[PDB]
Every structure is written in C-alpha cells, then in structure tokens.
Design a protein around this nucleic acid. Structure first.
Ligand SMILES: [Mg+2]
Ligand SMILES: [Mg+2]
Ligand SMILES: [Mg+2]
Ligand SMILES: [Mg+2]
Ligand SMILES: [Mg+2]
Ligand SMILES: [Mg+2]
Lengths: 194, 194, 194
DNA sequence: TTTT
DNA sequence: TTTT
DNA sequence: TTTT
C-alpha cells in the first residue's frame, strides 16, 4: 500500500505493543527491527496470514449486517502527543467506537468463542488504538466462514481503560527513548570513527 | 485422491495414533484438527515428504522382489466396531499380513538399520492397522535408493499384540468421546445463542 | 559450482568446525550429514542467505577500495596433513593473509560493529582456514549496504593462534576417526548380512 | 497489518 | 498419508 | 559456503 509503510517507518504501532511490554526477547528483537528501519530507510517482508487479509472486508461487511453501525476506514493515526507512535485500526465505528478484526485459524476462532475474551496482546493492541485516536471503545470481531453460520461471527466490546493506557504510554515512551538513544549512540561511534 | 479424504474426514487414523496416546500438546492439537474437520467439512494441507511419496511404489516393488509375497493395495479400512476410526495400510500381504512402508531421510533409514526396531510411534501405527483389519502381522519396510545396494532395503516383521491393541481402543474411544462431546458442547452453546 | 561440491563431499570444512567442537546435537547431526554424503555420493540443499551470496563480491571490492590489498580467489584448500579436511576462504590476501566475508542481516552487522569482535564460531572458521593454508592472519569483513555509508563496512584482523589450531586438529581428527569407523562399521554389518 |  |  |  506504499504511502502507508512510509507513515510506519521506524514507529511503534498498536499491533506490536505486546512485544514492547513483554517481561523478554521479543522487546529487543522489535527494538532491533525499528532501529534497522530508521537506519536503513526500509522494512523486511504465510497461508493463514494471507486469509486474514483477504477475508477482512468479508468481516467488515458482516459486522455491519449484524450491527448497522457506520464504519469508516482510516490509515495510520499518530498518537496525539507521543512522537514515533501510532495505530491502524480496522475501522472508525460511529463517533466514539472502533473495530479490530481477526480472521484467524478456525481453532483459534473457536477458542475465542469458547472463552468470550480476546487474547491479552489484542487487549494491548486495542487499548493503544484507543490511546491514539481518543476513542471510547473497540468492538473486537473474530470471523471464520469455514464454520457453520451460527459459529462464523463473534463480537465483544472492549471499553477504553485509562489506567492501562497510562502504563502503555510510559513503556512505549521508555522504549522509544532507548531506541532513539541507541541510534544516536551508533551514529556517534560511526562518525567519530572518520 | 479426493474420494479418500472424504473417507478420512474427522476420523482418528492409524498414523495419528501416537499423538492420541502421548503423555501432551500433540493430543489436543490433533483433537483440534478433527474438531475443525468435522465442523468445517474439510482439511488443511516438504521435500522429504515428497520423496517418501514418489518412492513408495519403488519400495512396494522391492518388498515383492525380496519376498515374493502377493500384495494388494487398499483404501481406508474402518475399524470393525469403533466408529470414526480407521487405517490406511500400504498393503494387504497374503491372507493375514500387511505392509507399512517408510522412505525417509537417509540418516533415519540408517538408524532403523542400526537398531533393527521401528520407532515406537510406528509400532502404534502398525498395531492400529492390525486392529482395523484383523490382520496377524505387519512387515515394516524402510527404503532408500540413495545408498549402496546392500543398505537400501530393510524389513522387519511385527506381530499383532492384542494387549497393546486393547489399550489403543480404550484411548481412542476416550479421545473420540471427548471429541464428539466437545462438538456437541459447541453446537449447543452456539445454537441457544440464537 | 559443481566441480567444487565434488572437492567437498564427505569432508570436514572450516565453516562447520564450530559444530564439530560444540559441547552437543550439532556435532552428531553434522557427523550424520557427512556419513550420508560419503555413503550416498551426494549432498542435500533462504532470503538472508541469498543476499550474503550476491553481495559477497560487493564486499570483496569494498575491502580492496579500503585496503588496496591484492586479493586472489581460491577453491577448497585441503588441510596440509589431515585427510578429509579443508577450507574455502573468501580470499588469499597478500602473501600471508586471508579474507572471510559476511554480509548478514543488518542487525547482526550492527552487533558486530557494536562489539568489534566476530562470533566465536567464525573465530573457529578463520583459524581453520589458517590451519589449512598456513596463512598468518585473516581479515574479517562484515558488509551491509542498506545502512549509512559510515556504517556499511567493518573489518578486524584476526591473528593465527597456534594453540587453538592444535585443539581443532585434535577434535577434527577425533571426529574424523569416528566418522570413518562408523561407515566401516555399517559397511561390515550390511555386507556380512549377505 | 496480516496469523501463532 | 507423506518425513521429524 | 550462503544467514541464525
Ligand atoms: Mg488493524
Ligand atoms: Mg485486524
Ligand atoms: Mg500407510
Ligand atoms: Mg508408509
Ligand atoms: Mg568462505
Ligand atoms: Mg563468507
């Protein structure tokens, strides 16, 4: 989608927030990606991933057939105050809502139905979208058409949690500080080295 | 092979028996596959796997050149009594025998020769084939033509073990019970939910 | 490159030395590869690997633009005394030097710059090249053009270490002894078996 | 961002 | 079912 | 040998 990758280069984004905040390898590996993005000026690049992608509009439609909500697609929404940070929600719902859509493996979809509550990393994803957009709630949608009709669609609403947001902004600010510093640090070793 | 996948949909089968019976992740992941098969009405889908497949008839021939046995290819043989359970032996040998063929990685083949006894998961595979067909023995064949002639072929006979069979049928019955129930359970949550 | 694989069949080589010498799975898996190579008469066969390969000549050039050294490309150099053992340096530098080139993932390249010292497995690689060729030093080069100019190139010299070489030759001799024996052992079981 |  |  |  080209112009959009450009808006994401070297930025922390909602779908990567669990990695930032994990108590671990994934935090440093993510840090390493973004360091490389900022330095090199571009990014790097499966079958289940490829379905989640094609079937996304199918779910967007379904959410509407089910709710009658007015849904606007948007690009990257930069955090209001924190620089180098943003979100790409799957939709603006109404005046104060959002939609985040998954179209995963059937068994995953089943477990979401089984438990009624989305995985904690998606909580972090959704809270961050809310932080970035100032929205009040996000409707979490899981879709899979391979199943019987009465099992294809699941929705659950997730309320903005200002406490969790405050933490995230702390952690993301911390993580961003290290990241900038690290780049700085490297630029200064390499340059003196002339 | 189309019509055959149909005979396997949502069924426990001989080659998956070690997963059922393991003391673990693989049991639940298998359970999850079959739950999804039954619900969705279809299945999901490497280089060593691709050889084992092409070279299989090469081994079938070799077994005959070596034994002079009369070998009949068959499809899925449903367990005589337990429903949703079956086997696909690589052959009916004689009136009371079977053949199960592997054409693995050379080093694997070498280890089979080194030890003379097939991996325990293939024991379970073969016992199950015997359970399903009522046969008396299975000739386990390992083949690899990449090696010198005097190392390409290995055969060892495995006698029906009624004790092990009894266990398997217990475990598979248990596992099937959970599987049906789980589907049932899900169908009833989803349906009341209307 | 065909004629070169032929010179490597069933041989221990510099880039596999860390596997030989590890205190582990990788030693036996390597042993297994070479056993299979010798027995079958051939070998088995990603995106980062594919770059390291294309970009190698780019680095060779750069090393020269930076040093003005006279660099000769060579094939496999068999150890002077130990049979079934060899090295493929990325270059003969001068009369007494070598070059070993990496063109890895950016982040890896960055860590090499960060620490100034190559990973211990490359130490083993380079020492072995020196053992095989009798050279006095190897210039370790890490290259990545995706980065800013002042970060693309890193070089560090590694001096021949006769102590480490002596060990390697012991370990490789040991490992080779087992490997020959194992083949022997197998040939004799299989052959009596006639 | 896309799925585990 | 196909190989680890 | 090529990268982790
Ligand atoms: Mg999104
Ligand atoms: Mg989504
Ligand atoms: Mg079979
Ligand atoms: Mg088979
Ligand atoms: Mg080399
Ligand atoms: Mg190299």
């Amino acid at each position: 989608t080209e112009e959009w990758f450009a808006a994401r280069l070297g930025k922390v984004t909602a779908s990567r927030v669990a990695d930032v905040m994990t108590k671990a390898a994934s935090r440093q590996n993510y840090m390493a990606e973004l360091i490389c993005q900022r330095l090199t000026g571009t990014q790097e690049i499966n079958a289940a991933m490829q379905r989640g992608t094609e079937l996304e509009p199918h779910a967007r439609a379904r959410y509407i057939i089910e709710t009658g909500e007015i849904v606007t697609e948007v690009g990257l929404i930069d955090h209001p105050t924190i620089a180098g940070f943003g979100a790409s929600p799957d939709g603006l719902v109404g005046d104060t809502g959002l939609i985040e859509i998954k179209c995963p493996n059937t068994w995953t979809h089943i477990e979401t139905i089984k438990t009624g509550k989305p995985k904690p990393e998606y909580i972090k994803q959704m809270q961050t979208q809310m932080a970035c957009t100032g929205r009040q709630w996000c409707d979490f949608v899981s879709y899979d058409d391979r199943l019987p009709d009465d099992m294809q669609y699941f929705c659950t609403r997730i309320e903005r949690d200002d406490a969790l947001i405050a933490e995230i902004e702390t952690e993301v600010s911390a993580f961003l500080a290290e990241l900038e510093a690290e780049i700085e640090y490297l630029k200064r070793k390499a340059a003196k080295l002339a």
